[PDB]
């Protein structure tokens, strides 16, 4: 038989900072690098997918996960915590579709997912998520890119970096980003900014990349990755 | 149970000198159809007590499961205490009434027979919760035909032997086969004594049909 705690584990420090969220932001910082770029024509999400032992089956578990026909997710930090956030995002997208009969807007999904992330920073006997989320989507003739951090806040981005050396990524992205980029050119800079902190030569099994446009969100096949990966397309 | 499906008819019971005897036919009638012609309606509760039930047979199997377990659970302890015939009857009175008050009753009419402390016990339980003690008991159509025959002999002789009580029941079961449409000529004889509970197998009452010729 079990009971369940009713008291919050995340509390305010004498300085005025929520200590558990501060350390949750440190968990994502030590995770695998992930980048997202909006290019007006479409959104591109790329992440480091290092299997390390080669005995691992690469195609079995994916880091880039689809939520609906036009929305996808990429993360940095802990795997198990992200997987729960995928299922919750997938469920919230379906609940919206049953009521309004319209595909969920990207900004509207993020607001609902961030509310769940806020809940775990205030509810009894639970720790915050150690995951920062990258949400991409296409609606109203416009591409979207959002960031959802452990606290429950959300930011709209043109281009952003996560995981290890994210500060080095963000400084590299602002030099590399342009207005009115092409979707196929956006994949080039996304796979290049990930190579800034990688060290062990990139193969089509080493990274995972997903694109989102007017046709919808889909994960790129290893054959499509191999074409882009050999320095040039 | 709101509507009974497979039902058993009359159950007899009469106490003699040094024990009680209970009899019931092995028939489970489905409305007018006699579907199951070989089912046990009389059970052994423990070592001194026995039970015979009328009405819905599916409801009886549930009581066979509960009372069966209650005896087993008591025998696990082995503290020297056992359920008396009066205790089983008192439980059954309280259990049938409880489900009556819930508006979901067990469609049953029981005859409790037992022998403890040198005393013979015979109890009756309705589906509503009506209970009493009687020297002779009969259920269903037995209360209309077999009971008058039981009360007649007990008026002349209150204390009967094991042989006299046995042939009395066999005489009552013959009449029940003549005038009850849901009865069958295959019954079990269950008897409690100081030695224990004993139930005999298939037994048929001999019937006379000589009155079929003397119409004209």
């Amino acid at each position: 038989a079990k009971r369940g705690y009713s008291f919050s584990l995340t509390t305010f420090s004498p300085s005025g900072k929520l200590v558990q969220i501060e350390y949750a932001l440190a968990a994502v910082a030590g995770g695998a690098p992930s980048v997202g770029i909006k290019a007006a024509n479409g959104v591109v999400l790329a992440t480091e997918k290092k299997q390390k032992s080669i005995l691992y089956d690469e195609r079995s578990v994916h880091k880039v996960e689809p939520i609906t026909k036009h929305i996808g997710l990429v993360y940095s930090g802990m795997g198990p915590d992200y997987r729960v956030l995928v299922h919750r995002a997938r469920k919230l997208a379906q609940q919206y579709y049953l009521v309004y009969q319209e595909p969920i807007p990207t900004a509207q999904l993020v607001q609902r997912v961030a509310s769940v992330m806020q809940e775990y920073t205030q509810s009894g006997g639970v720790r915050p998520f150690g995951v920062s989320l990258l949400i991409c989507g296409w609606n109203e003739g416009r591409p979207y890119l959002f960031q959802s951090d452990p606290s429950g806040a959300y930011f709209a981005w043109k281009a952003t970096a996560m995981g290890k050396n994210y500060v080095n990524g963000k400084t590299f992205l602002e030099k590399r980003y342009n207005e009115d980029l092409e979707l196929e050119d956006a994949i080039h800079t996304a796979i290049l900014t990930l190579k800034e902190s990688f060290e062990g030569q990139m193969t089509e099994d080493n990274i995972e990349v997903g694109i989102c446009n007017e046709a919808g969100f889909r994960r790129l096949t290893p054959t499509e990755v191999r074409d882009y990966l050999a320095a040039i397309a | 149970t709101q509507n009974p499906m497979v039902t058993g008819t009359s159950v007899l019971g009469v106490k003699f000198d040094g024990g009680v005897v209970i009899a019931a036919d092995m028939l489970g009638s489905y409305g007018s159809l006699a579907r199951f012609r070989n089912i046990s309606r009389i059970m052994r509760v423990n070592d001194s007590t026995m039970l015979g039930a009328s009405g819905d047979y599916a409801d009886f199997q549930y009581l066979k499961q509960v009372l069966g377990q209650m005896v087993i659970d008591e025998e696990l302890l082995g503290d020297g205490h056992s359920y008396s015939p009066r205790a089983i009857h008192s439980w059954l009175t309280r259990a049938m009434y409880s489900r009556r008050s819930k508006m979901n009753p067990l469609w049953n009419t029981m005859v409790i027979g037992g022998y403890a402390d040198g005393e013979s016990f015979l109890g009756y339980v309705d589906m509503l919760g009506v209970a009493y003690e009687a020297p002779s008991l009969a259920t269903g159509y037995g209360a209309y035909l077999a009971q008058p025959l039981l009360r007649e002999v007990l008026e002349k002789q209150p204390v009967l032997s094991q042989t006299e009580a046995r042939e009395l029941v066999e005489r009552c079961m013959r009449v029940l086969y003549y005038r009850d449409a849901r009865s069958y000529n295959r019954f079990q004889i269950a008897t409690v004594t100081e030695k224990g509970v004993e139930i005999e197998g298939p037994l048929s009452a001999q019937t006379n049909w000589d009155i079929a010729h003397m119409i004209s």
Partner: protein, 204 residues
Amino acid sequence: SIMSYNGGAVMAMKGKNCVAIAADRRFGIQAQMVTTDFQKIFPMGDRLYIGLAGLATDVQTVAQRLKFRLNLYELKEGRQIKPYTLMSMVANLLYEKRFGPYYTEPVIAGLDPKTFKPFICSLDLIGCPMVTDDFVVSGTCSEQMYGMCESLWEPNMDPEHLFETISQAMLNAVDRDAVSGMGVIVHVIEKDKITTRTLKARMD
């Protein structure tokens, strides 16, 4: 009949680039008329209207609870509601009460924002949406309204021609119904203007 207790009739019609919605104004219990000025058509977003016909309580209750969900939708999302979105919102609201429904048959009429396209639909008491390109009717004199709309309606109609069509389709159908009448209000919805007219009708 539960629907025939208070009476009422609601009609919607399609034109070229305009939508028209008309309803009777009678509020009465069974046979006795009570109020001449009763609102049945409710604004939902400058260029989208809903007309409710059936039980007078459920007409007002649904309109209030739909406005409750409308404003929250327009605050969470930085956009005005779509006609298809509202249709599904009414369908969801009514189906929540499946085994105890609001005795009213909603009719939505209005133009699609940003895309200027006309839209009309009608729903059941339990919330079953159906889209048409011609007309949708609800009320006690449903059969009377069908007979007028099947003969008068034309494919492409201008705001002035659509007004004359929906007005005559209501007036004549209402005059054959005992529980409906006492004036007919018409809302003609255009991209530039909303024209509201109260027609001269029989007061018996």
